[PDB]
Design a protein around this nucleic acid. Structure first.
Ligand code: ADP
Ligand code: ALF
Ligand code: MG
Length: 509
RNA sequence: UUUUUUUUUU
Protein backbone atom coordinates (compact mmCIF):
# COMPACT_ATOMS: atom_id res chain seq x y z
CA UNK A 1 0.00 0.00 0.00
CA UNK A 2 1.08 3.56 -0.81
CA UNK A 3 2.73 5.46 2.07
CA UNK A 4 2.21 9.24 1.88
CA UNK A 5 4.65 11.34 3.92
CA UNK A 6 3.50 14.67 5.32
CA UNK A 7 6.66 15.97 7.05
CA UNK A 8 6.94 18.67 9.73
CA UNK A 9 6.20 22.21 8.45
CA UNK A 10 7.29 25.48 10.07
CA UNK A 11 5.10 28.15 8.43
CA UNK A 12 1.76 26.33 8.01
CA UNK A 13 -1.57 27.96 8.96
CA UNK A 14 -2.68 27.45 12.57
CA UNK A 15 -5.68 25.14 12.92
CA UNK A 16 -8.02 25.94 15.82
CA UNK A 17 -11.24 24.56 17.30
CA UNK A 18 -13.02 27.62 15.84
CA UNK A 19 -11.47 27.20 12.38
CA UNK A 20 -12.50 23.52 12.30
CA UNK A 21 -16.04 24.47 13.43
CA UNK A 22 -16.28 27.20 10.78
CA UNK A 23 -14.95 24.80 8.12
CA UNK A 24 -17.62 22.17 8.97
CA UNK A 25 -15.11 19.56 10.15
CA UNK A 26 -16.20 19.69 13.80
CA UNK A 27 -19.76 19.85 15.12
CA UNK A 28 -20.70 22.44 17.77
CA UNK A 29 -21.18 19.76 20.47
CA UNK A 30 -17.57 18.47 20.35
CA UNK A 31 -16.27 22.05 19.86
CA UNK A 32 -18.11 22.99 23.07
CA UNK A 33 -16.66 20.07 25.08
CA UNK A 34 -13.02 20.75 24.15
CA UNK A 35 -13.31 24.57 24.32
CA UNK A 36 -14.49 24.19 27.94
CA UNK A 37 -11.20 22.44 28.83
CA UNK A 38 -9.58 25.86 28.23
CA UNK A 39 -6.39 24.75 26.47
CA UNK A 40 -4.34 27.68 25.06
CA UNK A 41 -4.80 26.15 21.61
CA UNK A 42 -4.66 22.80 19.84
CA UNK A 43 -1.30 21.01 20.05
CA UNK A 44 0.65 20.48 16.82
CA UNK A 45 -0.36 16.80 16.48
CA UNK A 46 -4.02 17.78 17.07
CA UNK A 47 -3.81 20.48 14.38
CA UNK A 48 -2.24 18.01 11.94
CA UNK A 49 -4.45 14.91 12.45
CA UNK A 50 -8.06 15.90 13.20
CA UNK A 51 -9.15 16.81 9.64
CA UNK A 52 -7.25 14.00 7.83
CA UNK A 53 -8.68 11.37 10.20
CA UNK A 54 -12.20 12.66 9.40
CA UNK A 55 -11.54 12.92 5.63
CA UNK A 56 -13.69 10.85 3.25
CA UNK A 57 -10.43 9.64 1.64
CA UNK A 58 -10.03 5.86 1.75
CA UNK A 59 -6.88 5.84 3.94
CA UNK A 60 -5.21 4.74 7.16
CA UNK A 61 -3.27 7.17 9.35
CA UNK A 62 0.09 7.02 11.15
CA UNK A 63 0.92 9.91 13.49
CA UNK A 64 4.16 10.72 15.32
CA UNK A 65 4.39 13.37 18.02
CA UNK A 66 6.57 13.80 21.09
CA UNK A 67 5.70 12.63 24.59
CA UNK A 68 3.00 14.60 26.43
CA UNK A 69 1.86 16.64 23.41
CA UNK A 70 -1.79 15.55 23.35
CA UNK A 71 -1.97 12.49 21.09
CA UNK A 72 -4.97 11.17 23.09
CA UNK A 73 -7.36 13.99 22.10
CA UNK A 74 -5.83 13.91 18.60
CA UNK A 75 -7.73 10.61 18.08
CA UNK A 76 -10.64 11.07 20.55
CA UNK A 77 -11.83 14.35 18.97
CA UNK A 78 -12.27 12.96 15.43
CA UNK A 79 -13.72 9.72 16.81
CA UNK A 80 -16.46 11.71 18.58
CA UNK A 81 -17.04 13.68 15.37
CA UNK A 82 -17.46 10.44 13.41
CA UNK A 83 -20.03 9.26 15.97
CA UNK A 84 -21.93 12.54 15.50
CA UNK A 85 -21.70 12.28 11.68
CA UNK A 86 -23.24 8.78 11.78
CA UNK A 87 -25.44 9.21 14.87
CA UNK A 88 -28.61 7.68 13.35
CA UNK A 89 -26.80 4.58 11.99
CA UNK A 90 -26.08 1.46 14.09
CA UNK A 91 -26.50 3.57 17.25
CA UNK A 92 -26.19 0.62 19.69
CA UNK A 93 -22.97 -0.66 18.10
CA UNK A 94 -19.23 -0.21 18.66
CA UNK A 95 -17.85 2.16 16.01
CA UNK A 96 -14.37 2.78 17.44
CA UNK A 97 -12.00 0.31 19.12
CA UNK A 98 -8.93 1.74 20.87
CA UNK A 99 -6.18 -0.69 21.97
CA UNK A 100 -3.42 0.06 24.51
CA UNK A 101 -0.45 -2.03 25.79
CA UNK A 102 -1.29 -1.60 29.52
CA UNK A 103 -4.53 -1.78 31.49
CA UNK A 104 -3.85 1.54 33.26
CA UNK A 105 -3.38 3.35 29.94
CA UNK A 106 -6.64 1.91 28.55
CA UNK A 107 -8.38 3.07 31.74
CA UNK A 108 -6.76 6.51 31.46
CA UNK A 109 -8.03 6.85 27.88
CA UNK A 110 -11.53 5.94 29.16
CA UNK A 111 -11.18 8.64 31.85
CA UNK A 112 -10.31 11.12 29.08
CA UNK A 113 -13.48 10.14 27.20
CA UNK A 114 -15.42 10.78 30.44
CA UNK A 115 -13.82 14.24 30.68
CA UNK A 116 -15.30 14.97 27.22
CA UNK A 117 -18.70 13.72 28.49
CA UNK A 118 -18.47 15.96 31.59
CA UNK A 119 -17.79 19.10 29.52
CA UNK A 120 -20.93 18.44 27.44
CA UNK A 121 -23.62 16.09 28.76
CA UNK A 122 -25.08 15.93 25.22
CA UNK A 123 -22.12 13.68 24.31
CA UNK A 124 -22.97 11.02 26.95
CA UNK A 125 -25.17 9.29 24.32
CA UNK A 126 -21.87 8.22 22.70
CA UNK A 127 -21.07 5.81 25.50
CA UNK A 128 -17.77 4.13 26.28
CA UNK A 129 -16.75 0.90 28.02
CA UNK A 130 -13.28 -0.37 28.94
CA UNK A 131 -12.38 -4.04 28.47
CA UNK A 132 -9.23 -4.82 30.47
CA UNK A 133 -7.77 -7.74 32.42
CA UNK A 134 -7.90 -7.85 36.21
CA UNK A 135 -11.51 -6.64 36.19
CA UNK A 136 -14.72 -8.64 36.50
CA UNK A 137 -15.62 -10.03 33.07
CA UNK A 138 -19.37 -10.32 33.82
CA UNK A 139 -19.61 -6.79 35.27
CA UNK A 140 -17.97 -5.42 32.10
CA UNK A 141 -20.37 -7.37 29.83
CA UNK A 142 -23.32 -6.05 31.88
CA UNK A 143 -21.97 -2.57 31.11
CA UNK A 144 -21.68 -3.38 27.37
CA UNK A 145 -25.33 -4.51 27.42
CA UNK A 146 -26.59 -1.59 29.53
CA UNK A 147 -24.71 1.22 27.77
CA UNK A 148 -24.45 -0.21 24.22
CA UNK A 149 -21.22 1.79 23.74
CA UNK A 150 -19.97 3.35 20.50
CA UNK A 151 -16.38 3.45 21.85
CA UNK A 152 -14.51 0.51 23.36
CA UNK A 153 -11.09 0.86 24.98
CA UNK A 154 -9.17 -2.31 25.65
CA UNK A 155 -5.99 -4.22 26.28
CA UNK A 156 -5.29 -7.05 23.80
CA UNK A 157 -5.81 -10.12 26.00
CA UNK A 158 -9.22 -9.18 27.37
CA UNK A 159 -10.35 -7.81 24.00
CA UNK A 160 -9.66 -11.16 22.29
CA UNK A 161 -11.50 -12.88 25.18
CA UNK A 162 -14.60 -10.72 24.54
CA UNK A 163 -14.35 -10.86 20.72
CA UNK A 164 -14.23 -14.67 20.62
CA UNK A 165 -17.59 -14.74 22.43
CA UNK A 166 -19.42 -11.52 21.49
CA UNK A 167 -18.01 -10.10 18.22
CA UNK A 168 -21.39 -10.55 16.45
CA UNK A 169 -23.40 -8.77 19.13
CA UNK A 170 -21.36 -5.53 19.40
CA UNK A 171 -18.54 -5.40 16.81
CA UNK A 172 -20.00 -5.88 13.28
CA UNK A 173 -20.13 -2.12 12.56
CA UNK A 174 -16.66 -0.92 13.61
CA UNK A 175 -15.32 1.94 11.44
CA UNK A 176 -12.06 2.83 13.24
CA UNK A 177 -9.45 0.98 15.26
CA UNK A 178 -6.66 2.82 17.08
CA UNK A 179 -3.33 1.37 18.15
CA UNK A 180 -2.07 3.72 20.86
CA UNK A 181 1.64 3.22 21.53
CA UNK A 182 1.50 1.53 18.11
CA UNK A 183 5.17 0.53 17.98
CA UNK A 184 4.83 -1.32 21.31
CA UNK A 185 1.67 -3.13 20.13
CA UNK A 186 3.52 -4.39 17.00
CA UNK A 187 6.48 -5.92 18.89
CA UNK A 188 6.69 -9.67 19.56
CA UNK A 189 4.05 -10.73 22.09
CA UNK A 190 1.53 -8.09 20.97
CA UNK A 191 1.79 -8.27 17.14
CA UNK A 192 0.07 -11.68 16.92
CA UNK A 193 -2.69 -10.45 19.26
CA UNK A 194 -3.26 -7.34 17.13
CA UNK A 195 -3.41 -9.50 14.00
CA UNK A 196 -5.99 -11.73 15.72
CA UNK A 197 -8.06 -8.71 16.80
CA UNK A 198 -7.81 -7.10 13.36
CA UNK A 199 -8.78 -10.34 11.57
CA UNK A 200 -11.90 -10.82 13.73
CA UNK A 201 -13.07 -7.22 13.29
CA UNK A 202 -12.53 -7.38 9.51
CA UNK A 203 -14.24 -10.78 9.15
CA UNK A 204 -17.26 -9.71 11.22
CA UNK A 205 -17.69 -6.26 9.62
CA UNK A 206 -21.13 -5.93 8.01
CA UNK A 207 -19.90 -3.74 5.11
CA UNK A 208 -16.56 -5.23 3.99
CA UNK A 209 -13.27 -6.78 5.09
CA UNK A 210 -11.50 -3.47 4.25
CA UNK A 211 -14.05 -1.07 5.81
CA UNK A 212 -12.12 -0.39 9.03
CA UNK A 213 -9.69 2.56 9.06
CA UNK A 214 -6.63 2.10 11.26
CA UNK A 215 -4.87 4.85 13.22
CA UNK A 216 -1.36 4.39 14.65
CA UNK A 217 -0.05 6.81 17.31
CA UNK A 218 3.32 6.96 19.06
CA UNK A 219 6.21 9.22 20.05
CA UNK A 220 8.53 6.50 18.73
CA UNK A 221 7.86 5.31 15.17
CA UNK A 222 9.01 5.58 11.54
CA UNK A 223 8.47 3.98 8.08
CA UNK A 224 9.41 0.52 9.42
CA UNK A 225 6.17 0.30 11.47
CA UNK A 226 4.11 0.32 8.25
CA UNK A 227 5.83 -2.95 7.34
CA UNK A 228 5.07 -4.50 10.74
CA UNK A 229 1.46 -3.26 10.51
CA UNK A 230 0.96 -4.52 6.92
CA UNK A 231 -1.40 -7.36 7.90
CA UNK A 232 -3.65 -4.99 9.92
CA UNK A 233 -3.83 -1.98 7.55
CA UNK A 234 -6.79 -2.34 5.13
CA UNK A 235 -6.59 0.77 2.96
CA UNK A 236 -4.69 1.40 -0.29
CA UNK A 237 -3.21 4.67 1.04
CA UNK A 238 -1.53 5.34 4.39
CA UNK A 239 -1.03 8.94 5.48
CA UNK A 240 2.04 9.43 7.71
CA UNK A 241 1.48 12.68 9.61
CA UNK A 242 4.74 13.67 11.33
CA UNK A 243 5.32 16.56 13.76
CA UNK A 244 9.00 15.62 14.25
CA UNK A 245 11.81 16.24 11.73
CA UNK A 246 13.43 13.27 9.95
CA UNK A 247 16.75 13.41 11.86
CA UNK A 248 15.48 15.29 14.95
CA UNK A 249 15.71 13.23 18.16
CA UNK A 250 12.38 11.75 19.32
CA UNK A 251 13.09 12.71 22.97
CA UNK A 252 11.35 15.87 24.18
CA UNK A 253 13.88 18.71 23.98
CA UNK A 254 12.56 20.49 27.11
CA UNK A 255 13.69 17.65 29.39
CA UNK A 256 17.01 18.38 31.10
CA UNK A 257 18.60 14.92 30.78
CA UNK A 258 21.60 13.68 32.75
CA UNK A 259 23.43 10.41 33.40
CA UNK A 260 25.21 9.36 36.61
CA UNK A 261 27.79 6.59 36.06
CA UNK A 262 28.83 4.29 38.93
CA UNK A 263 31.49 1.56 39.00
CA UNK A 264 28.92 -1.07 40.02
CA UNK A 265 25.23 -1.66 39.28
CA UNK A 266 24.32 -1.70 42.98
CA UNK A 267 25.93 1.73 43.47
CA UNK A 268 23.11 3.24 41.36
CA UNK A 269 20.82 2.48 44.34
CA UNK A 270 22.97 4.63 46.65
CA UNK A 271 23.30 7.39 44.02
CA UNK A 272 19.51 7.59 43.60
CA UNK A 273 18.94 7.66 47.36
CA UNK A 274 21.39 10.56 47.77
CA UNK A 275 19.85 12.38 44.80
CA UNK A 276 16.31 12.06 46.21
CA UNK A 277 17.57 13.20 49.64
CA UNK A 278 19.04 16.34 48.05
CA UNK A 279 15.88 17.13 46.04
CA UNK A 280 13.67 16.76 49.12
CA UNK A 281 15.93 19.16 51.05
CA UNK A 282 16.35 21.73 48.26
CA UNK A 283 12.68 21.70 47.21
CA UNK A 284 11.40 21.66 50.82
CA UNK A 285 9.54 18.37 50.10
CA UNK A 286 7.78 19.91 47.06
CA UNK A 287 8.92 16.94 45.02
CA UNK A 288 6.99 14.73 42.61
CA UNK A 289 9.13 12.06 40.97
CA UNK A 290 8.91 8.73 39.17
CA UNK A 291 11.69 6.17 39.52
CA UNK A 292 11.93 3.26 37.07
CA UNK A 293 13.58 -0.11 37.73
CA UNK A 294 14.23 -3.21 35.58
CA UNK A 295 12.13 -5.94 37.28
CA UNK A 296 9.09 -6.44 39.50
CA UNK A 297 11.13 -8.01 42.31
CA UNK A 298 13.73 -5.23 42.18
CA UNK A 299 11.01 -2.55 42.05
CA UNK A 300 9.47 -4.02 45.20
CA UNK A 301 12.94 -4.12 46.83
CA UNK A 302 13.66 -0.51 45.81
CA UNK A 303 10.31 0.55 47.30
CA UNK A 304 11.28 -0.89 50.68
CA UNK A 305 14.55 1.06 50.65
CA UNK A 306 12.83 4.30 49.62
CA UNK A 307 10.13 3.87 52.31
CA UNK A 308 12.80 3.38 54.99
CA UNK A 309 14.64 6.48 53.77
CA UNK A 310 11.78 8.79 52.74
CA UNK A 311 8.30 7.71 53.98
CA UNK A 312 8.58 10.40 56.71
CA UNK A 313 9.03 13.07 53.97
CA UNK A 314 6.89 11.86 51.06
CA UNK A 315 4.48 9.11 50.08
CA UNK A 316 6.16 6.21 48.26
CA UNK A 317 3.92 4.33 45.81
CA UNK A 318 4.65 0.85 44.39
CA UNK A 319 3.46 0.30 40.81
CA UNK A 320 4.03 -2.89 38.77
CA UNK A 321 2.18 -5.80 37.13
CA UNK A 322 1.92 -7.90 40.32
CA UNK A 323 0.05 -5.16 42.22
CA UNK A 324 -3.67 -6.07 42.18
CA UNK A 325 -5.63 -4.20 39.51
CA UNK A 326 -7.84 -2.47 42.11
CA UNK A 327 -4.69 -1.06 43.77
CA UNK A 328 -3.04 -0.15 40.46
CA UNK A 329 -6.10 1.93 39.55
CA UNK A 330 -6.36 3.57 43.01
CA UNK A 331 -2.65 4.48 43.11
CA UNK A 332 -2.83 5.94 39.57
CA UNK A 333 -5.79 8.12 40.63
CA UNK A 334 -3.87 9.28 43.72
CA UNK A 335 -0.57 10.03 41.93
CA UNK A 336 -2.42 11.99 39.24
CA UNK A 337 -3.84 14.36 41.90
CA UNK A 338 -0.93 14.52 44.37
CA UNK A 339 1.42 17.51 44.43
CA UNK A 340 4.33 15.37 45.61
CA UNK A 341 5.47 11.81 46.18
CA UNK A 342 7.57 9.12 44.59
CA UNK A 343 6.15 6.57 42.18
CA UNK A 344 8.38 3.50 42.00
CA UNK A 345 7.66 1.35 38.96
CA UNK A 346 8.56 -1.01 36.15
CA UNK A 347 7.95 -0.18 32.48
CA UNK A 348 4.26 -0.86 33.14
CA UNK A 349 4.39 2.93 33.69
CA UNK A 350 6.85 3.89 30.91
CA UNK A 351 4.29 4.72 28.20
CA UNK A 352 1.08 6.73 28.03
CA UNK A 353 0.50 7.46 31.71
CA UNK A 354 -0.15 11.15 32.35
CA UNK A 355 0.66 12.25 35.89
CA UNK A 356 0.55 16.05 35.89
CA UNK A 357 3.51 18.10 37.14
CA UNK A 358 6.08 15.37 37.73
CA UNK A 359 9.34 17.25 38.43
CA UNK A 360 11.81 14.44 37.73
CA UNK A 361 12.07 11.00 36.14
CA UNK A 362 14.76 8.74 37.63
CA UNK A 363 15.97 5.43 36.22
CA UNK A 364 17.99 2.75 37.95
CA UNK A 365 19.47 0.71 35.12
CA UNK A 366 18.19 0.38 31.57
CA UNK A 367 14.63 0.22 30.21
CA UNK A 368 13.08 -2.97 28.79
CA UNK A 369 13.50 -1.61 25.23
CA UNK A 370 15.41 1.31 23.65
CA UNK A 371 12.24 3.26 22.78
CA UNK A 372 11.18 3.19 26.44
CA UNK A 373 14.05 5.55 27.32
CA UNK A 374 12.14 8.22 25.38
CA UNK A 375 8.79 7.36 26.99
CA UNK A 376 10.19 6.99 30.53
CA UNK A 377 11.73 10.50 30.57
CA UNK A 378 8.56 11.70 28.83
CA UNK A 379 6.58 11.13 32.04
CA UNK A 380 7.85 14.65 32.88
CA UNK A 381 7.79 17.85 30.80
CA UNK A 382 4.21 17.21 29.62
CA UNK A 383 1.62 19.76 28.42
CA UNK A 384 4.17 22.59 28.16
CA UNK A 385 5.71 22.06 31.63
CA UNK A 386 9.41 21.79 32.52
CA UNK A 387 11.12 18.57 33.61
CA UNK A 388 14.39 16.78 34.34
CA UNK A 389 15.62 13.20 34.08
CA UNK A 390 18.54 11.29 35.61
CA UNK A 391 19.80 7.93 34.34
CA UNK A 392 21.69 5.97 37.02
CA UNK A 393 23.81 3.25 35.42
CA UNK A 394 27.10 1.42 35.95
CA UNK A 395 30.10 1.44 33.57
CA UNK A 396 29.18 -1.94 32.05
CA UNK A 397 25.83 -0.44 30.94
CA UNK A 398 27.53 2.40 28.98
CA UNK A 399 26.92 0.71 25.58
CA UNK A 400 23.22 1.54 26.15
CA UNK A 401 24.08 5.25 26.20
CA UNK A 402 26.09 4.79 22.99
CA UNK A 403 23.17 2.95 21.34
CA UNK A 404 20.88 5.90 22.18
CA UNK A 405 23.30 8.13 20.22
CA UNK A 406 23.79 5.78 17.26
CA UNK A 407 20.21 4.51 16.89
CA UNK A 408 18.13 7.50 18.07
CA UNK A 409 20.46 10.54 17.89
CA UNK A 410 19.96 11.08 21.64
CA UNK A 411 23.10 12.65 23.14
CA UNK A 412 23.01 13.29 26.90
CA UNK A 413 25.15 16.38 27.54
CA UNK A 414 25.32 16.14 31.34
CA UNK A 415 27.31 13.08 32.44
CA UNK A 416 29.01 12.58 35.83
CA UNK A 417 30.65 9.88 37.97
CA UNK A 418 29.49 8.61 41.37
CA UNK A 419 31.19 6.65 44.15
CA UNK A 420 29.24 5.92 47.36
CA UNK A 421 30.62 6.79 50.79
CA UNK A 422 30.75 4.01 53.39
CA UNK A 423 28.19 6.08 55.34
CA UNK A 424 25.43 5.91 52.69
CA UNK A 425 26.11 2.19 52.15
CA UNK A 426 25.65 1.42 55.86
CA UNK A 427 22.57 3.65 56.08
CA UNK A 428 20.85 1.91 53.15
CA UNK A 429 21.93 -1.68 53.89
CA UNK A 430 21.25 -1.78 57.66
CA UNK A 431 17.53 -1.06 57.15
CA UNK A 432 17.16 -3.88 54.59
CA UNK A 433 14.97 -6.60 56.12
CA UNK A 434 15.07 -9.03 53.15
CA UNK A 435 16.49 -12.52 53.76
CA UNK A 436 19.44 -13.83 51.67
CA UNK A 437 16.99 -16.03 49.72
CA UNK A 438 14.94 -12.91 48.86
CA UNK A 439 18.09 -11.05 47.79
CA UNK A 440 18.99 -14.03 45.57
CA UNK A 441 15.51 -13.92 43.95
CA UNK A 442 15.88 -10.18 43.31
CA UNK A 443 19.38 -10.37 41.78
CA UNK A 444 18.44 -13.43 39.69
CA UNK A 445 15.51 -11.43 38.22
CA UNK A 446 18.07 -8.73 37.25
CA UNK A 447 20.39 -11.32 35.66
CA UNK A 448 17.46 -12.54 33.53
CA UNK A 449 16.35 -9.02 32.50
CA UNK A 450 19.90 -7.98 31.58
CA UNK A 451 20.52 -11.26 29.72
CA UNK A 452 17.51 -10.50 27.48
CA UNK A 453 18.83 -7.07 26.33
CA UNK A 454 22.55 -7.87 25.82
CA UNK A 455 22.14 -7.95 22.02
CA UNK A 456 19.84 -4.90 21.74
CA UNK A 457 22.10 -2.70 23.90
CA UNK A 458 25.39 -4.28 22.73
CA UNK A 459 26.55 -5.25 26.23
CA UNK A 460 29.56 -7.44 26.85
CA UNK A 461 28.01 -10.59 28.36
CA UNK A 462 31.26 -11.52 30.14
CA UNK A 463 31.25 -8.16 31.97
CA UNK A 464 27.58 -7.20 32.46
CA UNK A 465 26.33 -10.53 33.84
CA UNK A 466 29.02 -10.97 36.53
CA UNK A 467 28.55 -7.31 37.50
CA UNK A 468 24.76 -7.68 37.88
CA UNK A 469 25.27 -10.95 39.81
CA UNK A 470 27.76 -9.29 42.20
CA UNK A 471 24.88 -7.13 43.49
CA UNK A 472 24.11 -10.11 45.78
CA UNK A 473 27.45 -9.73 47.59
CA UNK A 474 27.16 -5.94 47.73
CA UNK A 475 23.69 -6.09 49.32
CA UNK A 476 24.87 -8.72 51.87
CA UNK A 477 27.99 -6.58 52.54
CA UNK A 478 30.47 -9.27 51.39
CA UNK A 479 31.92 -8.57 47.89
CA UNK A 480 33.53 -12.03 47.41
CA UNK A 481 30.27 -13.86 48.23
CA UNK A 482 28.71 -15.46 45.12
CA UNK A 483 25.07 -16.48 44.64
CA UNK A 484 24.49 -19.99 46.02
CA UNK A 485 22.69 -22.25 43.51
CA UNK A 486 22.22 -25.91 42.54
CA UNK A 487 23.74 -27.75 39.57
CA UNK A 488 20.37 -28.29 37.86
CA UNK A 489 19.60 -24.55 38.13
CA UNK A 490 22.92 -23.71 36.46
CA UNK A 491 22.01 -26.25 33.73
CA UNK A 492 18.65 -24.50 33.13
CA UNK A 493 20.52 -21.20 32.64
CA UNK A 494 22.93 -23.00 30.27
CA UNK A 495 26.06 -21.85 32.10
CA UNK A 496 27.47 -25.06 33.63
CA UNK A 497 30.54 -24.95 31.34
CA UNK A 498 30.84 -21.15 31.18
CA UNK A 499 33.52 -19.06 32.93
CA UNK A 500 30.85 -16.33 33.09
CA UNK A 501 28.71 -18.75 35.14
CA UNK A 502 31.59 -19.65 37.47
CA UNK A 503 32.07 -15.92 38.25
CA UNK A 504 28.38 -15.42 39.12
CA UNK A 505 27.41 -18.55 41.07
CA UNK A 506 28.71 -20.95 43.73
CA UNK A 507 27.39 -24.52 43.40
CA UNK A 508 26.24 -24.92 47.01
CA UNK A 509 24.16 -28.04 46.29
C1' U B 1 14.89 -20.55 41.17
C1' U B 2 8.03 -16.09 36.10
C1' U B 3 13.14 -10.91 32.21
C1' U B 4 8.62 -5.80 31.01
C1' U B 5 3.73 -6.07 29.61
C1' U B 6 -0.48 -8.61 27.89
C1' U B 7 -7.65 -12.88 28.54
C1' U B 8 -8.45 -16.83 31.98
C1' U B 9 -13.34 -12.39 37.84
C1' U B 10 -15.81 -16.29 30.52
N1 ADP C 1 -4.40 21.28 23.24
C1 ADP C 1 -3.83 21.04 24.44
N2 ADP C 1 -3.16 21.99 25.12
C2 ADP C 1 -2.59 21.73 26.32
N3 ADP C 1 -2.65 20.53 26.92
C3 ADP C 1 -3.29 19.50 26.33
C4 ADP C 1 -3.93 19.69 25.03
N4 ADP C 1 -4.49 18.52 24.68
C5 ADP C 1 -4.23 17.64 25.67
N5 ADP C 1 -3.52 18.23 26.65
C6 ADP C 1 -3.03 17.62 27.90
O1 ADP C 1 -1.68 17.19 27.75
C7 ADP C 1 -1.45 16.07 28.63
C8 ADP C 1 -0.75 14.94 27.89
O2 ADP C 1 -1.56 14.43 26.84
P1 ADP C 1 -1.42 12.92 26.28
O3 ADP C 1 -2.48 12.74 25.23
O4 ADP C 1 -1.42 11.99 27.47
O5 ADP C 1 0.05 12.95 25.62
P2 ADP C 1 0.69 11.87 24.58
O6 ADP C 1 -0.34 10.82 24.29
O7 ADP C 1 1.05 12.72 23.39
O8 ADP C 1 1.92 11.36 25.30
C9 ADP C 1 -2.81 15.66 29.18
O9 ADP C 1 -2.92 16.06 30.54
C10 ADP C 1 -3.81 16.39 28.31
O10 ADP C 1 -5.02 16.75 28.98
F1 ALF D 1 3.54 9.73 23.93
AL1 ALF D 1 2.84 9.63 25.57
F2 ALF D 1 2.17 9.48 27.22
F3 ALF D 1 1.41 8.78 24.94
F4 ALF D 1 4.28 10.44 26.26
MG1 MG E 1 -0.44 8.83 24.58
Amino acid sequence: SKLIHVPKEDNSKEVTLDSLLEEGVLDKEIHKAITRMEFPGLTPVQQKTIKPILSSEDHDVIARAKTGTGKTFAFLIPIFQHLINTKFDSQYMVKAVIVAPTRDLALQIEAEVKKIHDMNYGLKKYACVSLVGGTDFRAAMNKMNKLRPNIVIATPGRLIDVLEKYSNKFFRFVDYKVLDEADRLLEIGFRDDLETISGILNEKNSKSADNIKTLLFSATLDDKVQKLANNIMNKKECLFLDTVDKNEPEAHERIDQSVVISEKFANSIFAAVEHIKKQIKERDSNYKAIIFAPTVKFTSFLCSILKNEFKKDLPILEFHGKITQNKRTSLVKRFKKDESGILVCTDVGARGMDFPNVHEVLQIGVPSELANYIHRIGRTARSGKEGSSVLFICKDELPFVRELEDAKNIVIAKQEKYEPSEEIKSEVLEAVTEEPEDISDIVISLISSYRSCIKEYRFSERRILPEIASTYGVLLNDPQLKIPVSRRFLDKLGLSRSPIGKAMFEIRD
